[PDB]
Design a protein around this ligand. Structure first.
Ligand SMILES: [Co+2]
Lengths: 128, 1109
């Protein structure tokens, strides 16, 4: 990644890297991490092994987006029903673009881009 | 203070009970009192000699003798005594069968009986110790014992101190010196500097030799004091002790008399080494100089040298340092040069700073360094003296400051501020980038601005055979400049063509550099636009940049009339003139054509040589630290740090024989206080003669002329004649001038400490680290050098290499193990300086060195580069024209850009592959990869203006010069690998090589590893990868040997501190030196070395050879 983008990144001793600002100074908001990195909300850290066995470790923080070298992202957010419970969200980079044409009124043309999170309902796990 | 020195001398001889012949002389009668309270103590040797004698007696237990080190030595406890001892108290010359010595205007001159060093058959090693290397001579233990006994019984002439050599009863004694030469360098978060201890012992006749070593390695003081006993400051020693004994009389002894066997009773090895006799009269080593070493795993190395040429002394410290490195672990001694280079630029008359990164500001610098600066009302600041007053020589200025040689001011807005721009100052912006003014290199009357960028690159040049240009890495590029002309083909056409292109280019707030960027094809220009640039001939661009450099506002579009060529003898000329004067441009020579014509290449007009600060020269100590520490904050891989063990450098100015040519030598040798050797002692009469030869005098540089004139101005005489030396007048040996003239040069970082100070300051600011913090630098690029030659009658071809090869680790190590040269060919191939060029300076199995070196490259992720010196192919002479460019090219490429993987992916390096020639397989794959025409276009464009004509096709592809010779060179390489690998097979060393090297050696020797691998077997190549090494058992085994050695030494430290604190009558020394505070640290250390955190901090270091734990 670093080699395909000369001068866009600042490589870190630990194996991570960060994008550079329009003005040449690093932007901590986006952290490139190695393939096979581990993400832990218990320790609030991203870890990975090094060839030397040291184990690297950076903070896992809510206002950051962690991205692996093939474009898959990881970030933290509160559960949709509960601001006090948090979990990790993976975003895969193989997107699909939908197009919704020639749809009469009532057909839901705008719905294709509307948010699914607003439609969530919070139920229970069933026990007989 | 001269009688100061003679008093110190008289006094010490008196204390030793040696013969002697003014106000101070009277106040020392209480010497005569304590003399009758000394004969109640028996002679007890110092702590250093105690350790030496213990080894010697254990080592020679039950041998033909157990000799004693001399106990009555004159001890050189202070600097400067040894020099004063080297001449008679009353005269300016001295003469013995061993040395002619003279006090000269420039310092001291010493011409020893032998004027040069040898290496063939010189290095002898005694049995009964660690294994002997196959290439050394093996000496039986009983014979060593007898040579050592002869060595401490030196004859009376040799024992005579020069100082008292004219008195009625001349003093005769051994003199002796304690040295503490560095072996472990300091790295801030990581390692304390540590040193070994060496005891130099010598007959008083050879006190010049002690002066010699003391200047290079420092005076350690009186060894009899516990302040200077190594065991008592364990935190800063290696645990190791060396001894050197000078004994030139030993070249008179016969082989028979030392107990060597007659030829008939001798082994094949003994007969290879000449360690047997066919005649009762056969002299040991055939009467020639040698050195005889004894050592083993206990950490004490004892060398006898049978000659007093100063070189051997220097190289024996080296050897002994290398011994200590091998037994300490984690470190290497190397034979290598180096420099820390900061790119520079010619910024013209007018320059606005554009390289301070946002964030970097005067305020932030000031805030990071409370009390170091004096802030000025205008926004500038200046450093404070160690005494609290400001130093105007260095002015910190704001980001975006403008510099103008027209107004001679630095300006910026915030309300516009303005300070004077003056030649004797250095202006530095907040991210560390410097600006200063200087006269052009060819012309003291033209001045311009120089920018120095703070992102330095440190080059390291190891394992580089003689002729390979090891010193050239740190040599100055400005001395190589040639001043040529700007080419004009047809002046009307060409200037018209320049006109068209100028249609904003001559705008005074557009720099010369941007214009060059404008007119250089780049991959972010429209593909039509580049085709237009290709349409612009080479010389028209040069003419544009020249016009740009000299353009004045005042001419305002009538620039044309200021430029011309002369009409020379009715022919239009080819040199552009500015108002009739020939314009001068900077060039470098890049080798020679087939017929010996010079190849000259225009430098870019915005190029200035990088600023270099020498980091290494000949004797080097190095440590590998892991990444992610304080001193390696920006690295995932290990990093290598170095320190130069020598404070003075023993130079051989080969070039200075020709008058005016070597400016640096002539300057140095016209100074004062120097140690000089192998020069001809000259008199004021000789100076008067040389003055009167006004033509000859005028060829010296000015410094050397002043020296000739000082000597001419001295009224004449007998034993107080004045002597001097000239660079043009080396010592006559056999009525011809010697080819080994010598002087000890002051290390140029010590001589020019402002250059160090400025480098440090730029680095701190570049890192945004405070000045209170150390800011160590590690090695960035390794670029070794090779001497290449064409074939000749009795000289094998070694000219397959182009300017610059990259070699993956297996191929690299074939090169390093072989250290091949065309000098002294063997029966099957070329000469070899041995592993790492250290065969003459390594008393141990060279595999210990090789195992460590290998780990250093693999764990450090260091690309092995090889530059070409001498010749490229059979026909093109290069001298050191490429050696000098190395640091300039790499220091103007980013680490990402110069990574070998990146260059191969972009097509800038091309792999070499095997081929057939006359039906034989030629293994050209051993030559790695090499730069091609695309590398030149991509990167040499940053130094030169026409990067595509820098190297000819035959220079980049030397096989085109002659394919037969190219194939002959590769066969010579393969034969020489075989002959060298055979050494490791014959002594069994091959068994102690780490797996990747064992295999490598097996291939070199027989073609296949033991497992059946060859060089291209993926399994063999995988053993050289960083990850597989860090996972291996064998590497873990080295880390654990290092822990186990350190543990034993921490126990040996606790045992030594205790025994001292509980010896009778040591209580007042014991509190003064806070010895029990040391013994508590020594106890805390032992706990630390056995802990797991310590074992883990060692992962990514070199560890130790397990047999040596
Ligand atoms: Co050397």
């Amino acid at each position: 990644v670093l080699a395909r983008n000369p001068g866009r990144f600042e490589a870190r001793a630990d194996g991570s890297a960060v994008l550079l600002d329009d003005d040449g100074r690093p932007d901590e908001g986006i952290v490139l991490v190695p393939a096979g990195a581990h993400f832990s909300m218990r320790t609030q850290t991203v870890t990975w092994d090094r060839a030397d066995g040291r184990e690297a470790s950076i903070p896992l923080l809510a206002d950051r987006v962690y991205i692996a070298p093939g474009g898959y992202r990881v970030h933290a957010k509160h559960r949709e029903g509960d601001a006090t419970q948090w979990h990790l969200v993976g975003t895969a980079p193989w997107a699909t673009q939908a197009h919704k044409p020639a749809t009469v009124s009532g057909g839901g043309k705008s719905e294709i881009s509307k948010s699914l999170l607003d439609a969530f309902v919070f139920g229970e796990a069933y026990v007989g | 203070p001269t009688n100061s020195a003679n008093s110190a001398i008289a006094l010490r001889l008196e204390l030793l009970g040696a013969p002697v012949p003014e106000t101070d002389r009277l106040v020392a009668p209480i010497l005569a009192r304590q003399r009758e309270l000394t004969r109640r103590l028996a002679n007890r040797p110092c702590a250093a000699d105690r350790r030496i004698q213990a080894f010697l007696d254990s080592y020679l237990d039950g041998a033909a003798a157990q000799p004693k080190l001399p106990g009555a030595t004159l001890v050189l406890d202070q600097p400067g005594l040894a020099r004063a001892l080297s001449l008679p108290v009353d005269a300016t010359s001295f003469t013995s069968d061993y040395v002619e010595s003279y006090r000269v205007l420039s310092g001291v001159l010493h011409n020893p009986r032998n004027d040069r060093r040898t290496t063939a058959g010189v290095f002898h090693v005694a049995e009964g110790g660690l294994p002997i290397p196959d290439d050394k001579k093996a000496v039986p233990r009983d014979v060593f014992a007898r040579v050592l006994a002869a060595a401490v019984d030196a004859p009376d002439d040799l024992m005579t101190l020069p100082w008292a050599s004219t008195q009625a009863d001349p003093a005769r004694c051994f003199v002796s010196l304690l040295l503490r030469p560095v072996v472990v360098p300091e790295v801030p978060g990581f390692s304390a500097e540590r040193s070994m201890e060496i005891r130099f012992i010598a007959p008083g006749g050879l006190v010049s030799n002690l002066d010699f070593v003391e200047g290079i390695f420092g005076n350690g003081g009186d060894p009899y004091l516990p302040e200077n006993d190594a065991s008592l400051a364990p935190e800063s020693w290696t645990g190791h002790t060396g001894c050197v004994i000078l004994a030139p009389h030993l070249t008179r002894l016969t082989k028979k008399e030392l107990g060597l066997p007659a030829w008939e009773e001798a082994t094949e090895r003994q007969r290879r080494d000449g360690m047997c006799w066919r005649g009762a009269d056969e002299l040991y080593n055939d009467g020639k100089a040698f050195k005889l070493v004894a050592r083993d795993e206990r950490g004490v190395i004892v060398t006898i040298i049978a000659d007093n040429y100063y070189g051997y002394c220097k190289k024996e410290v080296k050897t002994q340092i290398s011994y200590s490195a091998n037994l300490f672990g984690c470190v290497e001694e190397e034979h290598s040069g180096g420099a820390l280079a900061f790119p520079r630029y010619n910024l013209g008359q007018e320059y606005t700073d554009v390289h301070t990164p946002a964030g970097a500001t005067v305020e932030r610098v000031l805030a990071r360094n409370p009390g170091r600066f004096e802030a000025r009302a205008d926004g500038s600041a200046v450093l404070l003296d160690d005494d609290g007053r400001p130093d105007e020589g260095i002015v910190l200025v704001p980001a975006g400051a403008h510099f103008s040689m027209r107004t001679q001011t630095v300006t910026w807005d915030r309300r516009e501020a303005s300070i004077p721009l003056l030649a004797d100052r250095v202006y530095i912006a907040p991210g560390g980038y410097r600006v200063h003014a200087k006269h052009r290199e060819g012309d003291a009357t033209q001045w311009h601005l120089v920018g120095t960028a703070p992102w330095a690159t440190q080059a390291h040049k190891p394992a580089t055979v003689s002729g390979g240009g090891k010193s050239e890495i740190s040599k100055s590029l400005l001395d190589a400049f040639v001043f040529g002309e700007a080419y004009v083909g047809d002046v009307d056409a060409d200037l018209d063509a320049v006109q068209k292109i100028l249609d904003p280019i001559l705008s005074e707030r557009r720099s010369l550099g941007s214009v060059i960027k404008l007119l250089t094809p780049s991959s972010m220009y429209t593909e039509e636009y580049n085709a237009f640039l290709e349409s612009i001939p080479a010389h028209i661009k040069e003419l544009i940049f020249t016009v740009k450099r000299y353009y004045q506002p005042g001419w305002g579009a009538d620039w044309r009339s200021h430029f011309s060529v002369g009409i020379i003898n009715g022919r239009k000329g080819n040199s552009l003139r500015l108002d009739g004067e020939v314009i001068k441009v900077n060039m470098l020579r890049v080798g020679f054509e087939d017929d010996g014509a010079w190849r000259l290449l225009s430098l870019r007009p915005d190029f200035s040589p990088a600023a270099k600060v020498q980091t290494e020269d000949d004797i080097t100590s190095s440590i590998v630290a892991p990444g992610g520490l304080e001193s390696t904050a920006g690295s995932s891989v290990s990093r290598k740090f170095v320190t130069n063990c020598e404070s003075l450098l023993f130079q051989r100015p080969d070039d200075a024989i020709v008058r005016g040519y070597d400016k640096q030598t002539e300057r140095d040798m016209s100074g004062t206080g120097l140690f000089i050797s192998n020069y001809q002692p000259l008199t004021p009469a000789d100076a008067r003669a040389m003055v009167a030869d006004a033509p000859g005098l005028s060829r010296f540089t000015e410094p050397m002329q002043e020296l000739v004139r000082r000597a001419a101005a001295i009224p004449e005489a007998p034993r107080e004649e004045t002597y001097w030396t000239s660079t043009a007048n080396p010592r006559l040996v056999g009525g011809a001038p010697t080819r080994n003239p010598r002087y000890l040069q002051v290390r140029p970082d010590i001589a020019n400490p402002r250059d160090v100070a400025l480098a440090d300051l730029s680095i701190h600011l570049y890192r945004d680290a405070p000045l209170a913090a150390p800011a160590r630098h590690g090695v960035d690029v390794v670029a070794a050098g090779r001497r290449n030659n064409p074939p000749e009658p009795g000289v094998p071809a070694l000219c397959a290499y182009n300017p610059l090869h990259y070699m993956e680790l297996p191929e690299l190590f074939m090169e390093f193990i072989s250290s091949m040269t065309g000098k002294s060919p063997s029966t099957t191939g070329a000469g070899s300086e041995g592993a790492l060029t250290k065969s003459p300076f390594n008393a141990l199995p060279p595999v210990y060195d090789l195992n460590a070196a290998l780990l250093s490259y693999a764990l450090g992720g260091y690309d092995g580069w090889l530059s070409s010196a001498g010749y490229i192919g059979p026909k093109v002479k290069v001298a050191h024209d490429i050696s000098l460019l190395v640091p300039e090219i790499f220091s103007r490429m980013t680490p990402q850009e110069r990574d070998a993987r990146a260059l191969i992916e972009a097509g800038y390096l091309e792999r070499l592959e095997d081929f057939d020639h006359e039906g034989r397989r030629i293994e050209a794959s051993r030559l790695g990869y090499r730069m091609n025409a695309a590398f030149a276009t991509a990167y040499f464009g940053r130094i030169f203006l026409h990067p595509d004509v820098v190297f000819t096709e035959e220079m980049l592809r030397p096989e085109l010069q002659d394919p037969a010779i190219f194939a002959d060179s590769v066969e010579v390489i393969v034969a020489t690998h075989r002959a060298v690998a055979k050494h490791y097979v014959d002594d069994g060393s091959i068994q102690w090589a780490v797996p990747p090297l064992k295999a490598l050696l097996e291939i070199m020797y027989s073609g296949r590893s033991e497992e059946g691998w060859t060089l291209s077997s993926p399994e063999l190549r995988a053993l050289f990868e960083r990850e597989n090494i860090l996972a291996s058992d064998w590497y873990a085994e080295r880390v654990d040997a290092k822990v186990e050695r350190d543990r034993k030494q921490a126990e040996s430290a606790i045992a030594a501190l205790t025994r001292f604190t509980t010896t009778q009558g040591n209580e007042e020394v014991t509190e003064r030196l806070d010895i029990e505070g040391r013994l508590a640290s020594a106890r805390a250390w032992l706990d630390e070395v056995t802990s797991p955190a310590y074992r883990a901090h060692l992962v990514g270091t070199l560890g130790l050879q397990p047999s040596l734990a």
